[PDB]
Design an enzyme around this catalytic site. Sequence first.
Site, short mmCIF file in Angstrom:
data_model
loop_
_atom_site.label_atom_id
_atom_site.label_comp_id
_atom_site.label_asym_id
_atom_site.label_seq_id
_atom_site.Cartn_x
_atom_site.Cartn_y
_atom_site.Cartn_z
N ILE D 13 0.79 -1.23 0.00
CA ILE D 13 0.00 0.00 0.00
C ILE D 13 0.82 1.27 0.00
CG2 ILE D 13 -1.75 1.29 1.34
CD1 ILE D 13 -2.63 -1.16 -0.47
N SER D 134 -4.14 3.49 6.76
CA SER D 134 -4.57 2.68 5.65
C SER D 134 -4.95 1.31 6.17
CB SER D 134 -3.44 2.56 4.65
OG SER D 134 -2.28 2.01 5.26
N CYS D 166 -9.86 -2.64 2.51
CA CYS D 166 -10.17 -2.79 1.10
C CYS D 166 -11.56 -3.38 0.90
CB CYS D 166 -9.11 -3.68 0.42
SG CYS D 166 -8.48 -5.10 1.34
N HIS D 194 -10.74 -13.79 -1.64
CA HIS D 194 -9.74 -12.76 -1.56
C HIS D 194 -8.31 -13.19 -1.78
CE1 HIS D 194 -7.66 -9.35 0.41
NE2 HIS D 194 -8.81 -8.72 0.46
N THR D 197 -2.31 -11.86 1.07
CA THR D 197 -1.60 -10.61 1.32
C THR D 197 -0.30 -10.85 2.03
OG1 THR D 197 -2.84 -10.47 3.26
CG2 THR D 197 -3.67 -9.11 1.35
N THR D 226 -12.75 -10.89 7.87
CA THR D 226 -12.68 -9.66 7.15
C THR D 226 -12.79 -8.43 8.03
OG1 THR D 226 -13.60 -8.80 5.13
CG2 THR D 226 -15.17 -9.80 6.71
N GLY D 227 -12.19 -7.41 7.44
CA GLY D 227 -12.16 -6.07 8.02
C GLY D 227 -13.49 -5.37 7.85
N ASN D 335 -7.76 -4.97 -4.72
CA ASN D 335 -7.52 -4.59 -3.34
C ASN D 335 -6.28 -3.78 -3.01
OD1 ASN D 335 -7.14 -7.83 -3.67
ND2 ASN D 335 -5.41 -7.05 -2.53
N1 LIG Z 1 -2.60 -4.98 0.50
C1 LIG Z 1 -3.91 -4.98 0.69
O1 LIG Z 1 -4.67 -5.79 0.17
C2 LIG Z 1 -4.46 -3.91 1.64
C3 LIG Z 1 -5.71 -3.32 1.42
C4 LIG Z 1 -6.21 -2.36 2.30
C5 LIG Z 1 -5.48 -1.97 3.41
N2 LIG Z 1 -4.23 -2.56 3.63
C6 LIG Z 1 -3.48 -2.26 4.87
O2 LIG Z 1 -2.20 -1.69 4.55
C7 LIG Z 1 -1.35 -1.90 5.70
C8 LIG Z 1 0.03 -2.28 5.20
O3 LIG Z 1 -0.18 -3.47 4.45
P1 LIG Z 1 0.61 -3.76 3.10
O4 LIG Z 1 -0.29 -4.65 2.30
O5 LIG Z 1 1.20 -2.50 2.52
O6 LIG Z 1 1.80 -4.65 3.68
P2 LIG Z 1 3.38 -4.67 3.48
O7 LIG Z 1 3.92 -5.61 4.52
O8 LIG Z 1 3.72 -4.90 2.03
O9 LIG Z 1 3.78 -3.16 3.82
C9 LIG Z 1 4.13 -2.79 5.15
C10 LIG Z 1 5.44 -2.07 5.00
O10 LIG Z 1 5.72 -1.41 6.23
C11 LIG Z 1 7.10 -1.63 6.53
N3 LIG Z 1 7.36 -1.46 7.98
C12 LIG Z 1 7.32 -2.42 8.92
N4 LIG Z 1 7.58 -1.92 10.13
C13 LIG Z 1 7.78 -0.63 9.91
C14 LIG Z 1 8.08 0.32 10.89
N5 LIG Z 1 8.18 -0.01 12.18
N6 LIG Z 1 8.26 1.59 10.46
C15 LIG Z 1 8.14 1.90 9.16
N7 LIG Z 1 7.84 1.00 8.24
C16 LIG Z 1 7.65 -0.30 8.58
C17 LIG Z 1 7.40 -3.00 5.98
O11 LIG Z 1 8.76 -3.09 5.59
C18 LIG Z 1 6.52 -3.09 4.74
O12 LIG Z 1 7.21 -2.82 3.52
C19 LIG Z 1 -2.01 -2.98 6.54
O13 LIG Z 1 -2.52 -2.41 7.75
C20 LIG Z 1 -3.14 -3.49 5.67
O14 LIG Z 1 -4.27 -3.97 6.39
C21 LIG Z 1 -3.71 -3.51 2.74
#
Ligand SMILES: NC(=O)c1ccc[n+]([C@@H]2O[C@H](COP(=O)([O-])OP(=O)(O)OC[C@H]3O[C@@H](n4cnc5c(N)ncnc54)[C@H](O)[C@@H]3O)[C@@H](O)[C@H]2O)c1
Lengths: 358, 358, 358, 358
Positions: D13, D134, D166, D194, D197, D226-227, D335
């Site tokens: 994200i 997010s 999402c 889904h 992730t 689910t959220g 998503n």
């Molecule tokens: N991918 C999806 O389908 C989706 C959809 C909606 C919402 N989200 C939400 O987005 C959020 C992040 O998920 P994502 O899919 O991007 O996962 P992801 O693991 O790819 O991204 C998280 C990133 O944060 C970094 N990180 C970890 N600890 C950290 C810290 N202490 N400080 C700074 N950065 C740090 C990680 O290296 C990673 O790259 C989640 O809460 C998730 O629920 C994801």
Amino acid sequence: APIKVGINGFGRIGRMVFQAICDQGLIGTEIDVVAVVDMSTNAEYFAYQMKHDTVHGRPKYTVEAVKSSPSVETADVLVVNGHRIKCVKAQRNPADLPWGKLGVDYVIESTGLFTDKLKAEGHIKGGAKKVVISAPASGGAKTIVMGVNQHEYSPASHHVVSNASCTTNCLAPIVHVLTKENFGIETGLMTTIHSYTATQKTVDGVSLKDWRGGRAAAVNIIPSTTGAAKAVGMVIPSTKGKLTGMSFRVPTPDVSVVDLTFRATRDTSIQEIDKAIKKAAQTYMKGILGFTDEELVSADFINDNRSSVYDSKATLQNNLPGEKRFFKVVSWYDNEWAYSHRVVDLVRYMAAKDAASS
Amino acid sequence: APIKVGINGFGRIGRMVFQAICDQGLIGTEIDVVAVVDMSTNAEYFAYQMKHDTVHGRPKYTVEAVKSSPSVETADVLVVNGHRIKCVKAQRNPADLPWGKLGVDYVIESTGLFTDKLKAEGHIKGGAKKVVISAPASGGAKTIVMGVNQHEYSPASHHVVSNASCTTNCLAPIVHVLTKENFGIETGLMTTIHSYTATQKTVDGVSLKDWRGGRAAAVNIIPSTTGAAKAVGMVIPSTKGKLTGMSFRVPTPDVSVVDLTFRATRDTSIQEIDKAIKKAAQTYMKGILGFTDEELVSADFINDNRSSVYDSKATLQNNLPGEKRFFKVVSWYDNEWAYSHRVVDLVRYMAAKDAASS
Amino acid sequence: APIKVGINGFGRIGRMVFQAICDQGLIGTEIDVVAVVDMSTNAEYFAYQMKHDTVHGRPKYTVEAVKSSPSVETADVLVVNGHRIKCVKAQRNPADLPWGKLGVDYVIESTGLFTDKLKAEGHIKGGAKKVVISAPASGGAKTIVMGVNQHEYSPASHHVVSNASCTTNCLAPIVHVLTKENFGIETGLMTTIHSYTATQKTVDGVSLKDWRGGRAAAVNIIPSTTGAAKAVGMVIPSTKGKLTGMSFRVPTPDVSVVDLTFRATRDTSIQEIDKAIKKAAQTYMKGILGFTDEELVSADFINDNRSSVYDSKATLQNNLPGEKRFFKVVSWYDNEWAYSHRVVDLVRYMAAKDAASS
Amino acid sequence: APIKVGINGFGRIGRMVFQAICDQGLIGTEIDVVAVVDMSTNAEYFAYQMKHDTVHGRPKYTVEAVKSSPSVETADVLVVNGHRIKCVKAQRNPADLPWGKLGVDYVIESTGLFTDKLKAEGHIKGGAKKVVISAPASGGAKTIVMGVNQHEYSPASHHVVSNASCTTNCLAPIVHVLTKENFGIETGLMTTIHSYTATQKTVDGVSLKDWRGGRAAAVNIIPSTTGAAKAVGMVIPSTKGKLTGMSFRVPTPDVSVVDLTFRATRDTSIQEIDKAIKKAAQTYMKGILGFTDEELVSADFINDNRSSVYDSKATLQNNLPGEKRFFKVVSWYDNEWAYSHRVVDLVRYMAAKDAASS
Ligand SMILES: NC(=O)c1ccc[n+]([C@@H]2O[C@H](COP(=O)([O-])OP(=O)(O)OC[C@H]3O[C@@H](n4cnc5c(N)ncnc54)[C@H](O)[C@@H]3O)[C@@H](O)[C@H]2O)c1
Ligand SMILES: NC(=O)c1ccc[n+]([C@@H]2O[C@H](COP(=O)([O-])OP(=O)(O)OC[C@H]3O[C@@H](n4cnc5c(N)ncnc54)[C@H](O)[C@@H]3O)[C@@H](O)[C@H]2O)c1
Ligand SMILES: NC(=O)c1ccc[n+]([C@@H]2O[C@H](COP(=O)([O-])OP(=O)(O)OC[C@H]3O[C@@H](n4cnc5c(N)ncnc54)[C@H](O)[C@@H]3O)[C@@H](O)[C@H]2O)c1
Ligand SMILES: NC(=O)c1ccc[n+]([C@@H]2O[C@H](COP(=O)([O-])OP(=O)(O)OC[C@H]3O[C@@H](n4cnc5c(N)ncnc54)[C@H](O)[C@@H]3O)[C@@H](O)[C@H]2O)c1
């Protein structure tokens, strides 16, 4: 001069030949796609197939499915970028196809059923001047790999030409700079980790001619054979019986990688080889051979149209530290994309030399 | 008295029905598999296909391939634990099959090509007495789901019978104890998240009847139609016009899950529903309906021969808090293995009822 | 006399070393698994992980989760077949692990964080007399592949032993009989087409040390490095600098295949090589090396506990037809299962040697 | 007057939000991204993550990686389109992040770790003026779904805002036209097939909070939660205690679909609901709600930024033919990509409202 082509078999390669003709700017101006042929003549279902691709996306051209005359029950004329293509019905014998009548001169044979130079001649019997087989050809046909031996074509002699296979088109450019720059392969074995194709099965099923190839495709590493084992010797006769290989079909849907292990004729190093392959990619193999300095994985080559794109880092790191003769060379290819671009490159070369002499 | 069965179409369901006969202890003694039919006669190839399965692994029986007479070229008799099964060549018409000659009475119709009553009767014309279509059927054949209405079978009238589809054998158990335990369903819709099958495609291809079905199967979520839509009303006429649904073919090779959503007839609760399903599991539906209290994923249902195996925790965590009418019921099933077992149970139930009368 | 062991890091190799101990019939009688160490101590969760495995099924043993005292909140002891293993909390340093207290003498170091010799000695200070790292080790630990060099282990000198990687336990058998039967390898490069691991990512994520390795695992051919590039020279001193290789991680969860391309020392043939390996497979390598004469794909090696099983057909079919120097050996392996069995077989070997001398 | 934003957690994200900001024209003129935060300060690794994405391909924008002074060892600044972004070192508490020093007013919190409204205020203590999470939040953070309730944003009191999940972004548009147009939803139940992730596992491993979520990702159908089980009641309070659902995590790497079964508040028809959704898609939900008339599968929605793009044919073909109250509505969503564009949409809205008042 619109080169008049017809496509027999509008499958993965047929629809990607069609898309390389539109994306490269040639529809209706340089090449006239007169007709396409496949099992149905429901142009709406072909439009659906063209508009949405799982692996290569939505295309940039636009497609309509119109009827030829309101007397027909379903749309039978496709209209791409204002150009009208006709949806012809699939014939069991190549000769029962009306090529001569539709005015089609170059037919791209891509069904996979007519790989024999003798059955493919049935197109010419139907009225085609020339035939390109999008596969290795049996029975005498000419096999050309663009960038390596397209010049040996002769309008006079060669009427059923074959553009080899996706893996040949990748291996042979690598082989061609190795010989022309004089590292020479003394002997060579080669593996292609390769995506699954439409000839494989979702689950374990019937495949009499290759027993393993009938195994559930997307959940097994499957040993089998490659088409470049024969064909690279055909394109470069100096490698006849010097080089052979296999294929491992792994669970990805497109892109593959060659993994050539050869021995050099003269003493050299992998640094000399890497230099000559980069050089060649920039000078005489440009467009066909490419290279990459990045840590790319396979999904980064979808839609890459070089025939072969040498992986500079995977090679330089994975060789023997002070080696003068035993070398690995890794190279990538989008088996569906670059090969479909090479088919269209060949049609246009052949049409150029056919006009050049007659 | 060995039941003389012949399997037409030795595919996923053909080979799993066969293996179920051996794993239950019926080969030679209780059930005699006279012949199997498919695209070949080379029994060394049916041996391979029986000995190595991607999903369900190696079988416990022993398989050998031998030649029937020294006159034949390729081994054409199967020998499974010293019992001989014959490898007959596939026929385009069921009537052309030597069923009366080989002495076959019961034919398990699992080619997929003859789901109509009338193309299925070609078997009886070829010398069979009864036919079990391993699928739902059109033309008017009897649809029986074991554990629900197998008692409706009559030896006098039901000659072409149908064991419905995998999803119907998973949903009708559930729908059965809901109607019998008086909760009832007023209306209801259903979704099967289901594994891909052999009718789907490796890469995007032709499938002119369901356009989406033709898309690469293992890299996509493909919406489509379920068999249990028409069939649960045939098995339970009480659900005629009160229950329909869809499928989402997802990228797994085997096992599927039903997600039933219904409105109950009387004001109840999901704990009442959970207890009643558990009861019916342990009492009247044993071996058909099962259940689990564990946190399981699809790979755990591989080789679970229950038709329907209720997931007590997913149902309970994912329903509305104090609801009396709107509920969700989740239930797993190995679409290959359990359905195959239920075919054998049907063959045997029909063959005993037929002896008990004629 | 029970060999006092404790497993530090109960993941894929830790639970497959545990199932290897139980399955071979060793738990309690010859090997006492005193404790297992992981991120938790909830024996109910550990027991959920043991009973259901996605790739190797339900185990043969039973796992129960008990409370050591009713004073603890959740079950912290595992009762596998009447025997009690304790669930000790994971320490960030080997040193703070209660080995000497628990009675543990042999530690299986399968976390994958303390692969260097010295952080591995952290268990010994804390009480263990011996340590087996389930991975190649740095800082000078003794690398042993069973069936190739375990005779080099000395109870006196070697306390931190490396069982090398899964690919070196596949490649080192074949290089061992190639030198022992005097074909000999001049130079050679290797590729393993390998299943994705626990260290790979479901979607593109972070991996700072190998860039490609953070890419979506199950939808890419990810080029990378192998562990047998170092380890086969440590074990076979002859191959120091003559052999290297690489890995391609492909979309399967388990089983991989080596594909060795070498140039022999003398003039030979692939039928010669084919005999030498098969012979060796039945005689002095029986149980480590294996072979197959069948047309198998990767899923037929799930649960095959040979270190290296050579594919006779894929080798003979995919080699140059009358070659005397340049060959390709293809061999499979279940990188989870075979490896884990070698771990249990190194503990058993080392242990008795220590009991033989002191 | 650029909005100064910082992204914490540059993962799936975070990088898609970054790319939605450059795609929509906004970088450097309407939004200035001062900093990005993750495990590394290696601009080169960030540039490699940006440029090559497995699912969404190569970005249109150009990335370079420069050093902020001749003194820093490794490139620590990104230069996307002439605009310079800083690579700030990841912090364990939001509060220790230098936001006031850098000059950052809005913070896109996307690590997945600081989902509590109190932990998230750490950013405002670090110097930031507002925080967007997010992900659904706890501890009373205001939840907004763009297109349904962002008009409830008060600059005054809403400081740490949550953009829900999402599935709430797909579900809440649909639920919103059904209540506004007066069909109503009495009680409702949903399921989302889904894509897996980053919180999931390649192979079976550790997952203490959801046991099934630890099972190998790309080889199972995994039931889970689910959220949108919580968040839709918060965006639309009419539906608290009336609507709930579950999740099935299947082997696709992106795109998901909402299967929604609900009972209306008045007698209506699925044709009526179909018209309303198309109407909304065209007038007040435009750009948020879309629809499709085509036979599409999951892969056709990659890079489709509508939050919820309704499947007209799947919904119309799979409902009960005479129904007036009990319906199924199916709608797709990428998503990763649509939610990312909505985060930028909310940040932008929020910022214009905060300017408007203060
Ligand atoms: N991918 C999806 O389908 C989706 C959809 C909606 C919402 N989200 C939400 O987005 C959020 C992040 O998920 P994502 O899919 O991007 O996962 P992801 O693991 O790819 O991204 C998280 C990133 O944060 C970094 N990180 C970890 N600890 C950290 C810290 N202490 N400080 C700074 N950065 C740090 C990680 O290296 C990673 O790259 C989640 O809460 C998730 O629920 C994801
Ligand atoms: N798939 C690849 O990556 C690839 C790469 C290089 C070359 N090729 C070669 O191209 C050929 C076709 O391969 P493909 O992958 O496109 O297969 P495909 O099955 O996807 O396409 C072939 C098409 O031909 C049609 N067809 C079959 N018989 C026909 C007939 N008698 N008349 C009209 N149409 C007919 C089929 O319906 C299908 O749409 C093969 O020889 C293959 O070796 C494929
Ligand atoms: N596999 C499942 O998930 C599943 C579940 C329940 C019911 N079924 C039903 O069983 C039927 C078969 O399904 P399948 O999954 O076994 O498919 P499959 O393709 O693996 O098996 C069908 C076999 O029949 C063979 N065959 C084709 N024509 C033949 C002929 N004329 N004579 C003899 N053999 C012929 C094919 O080569 C193939 O091996 C279908 O109608 C399906 O609805 C399948
Ligand atoms: N999976 C394979 O194919 C394979 C094959 C051969 C060798 N190995 C090796 O074995 C080791 C483990 O690999 P794996 O695939 O089982 O990985 P895995 O991640 O499944 O197992 C590692 C386990 O250690 C646990 N753990 C982490 N830190 C710990 C700590 N500080 N203390 C105690 N436990 C801790 C984790 O929770 C996890 O359960 C690695 O060194 C790997 O190279 C793996």
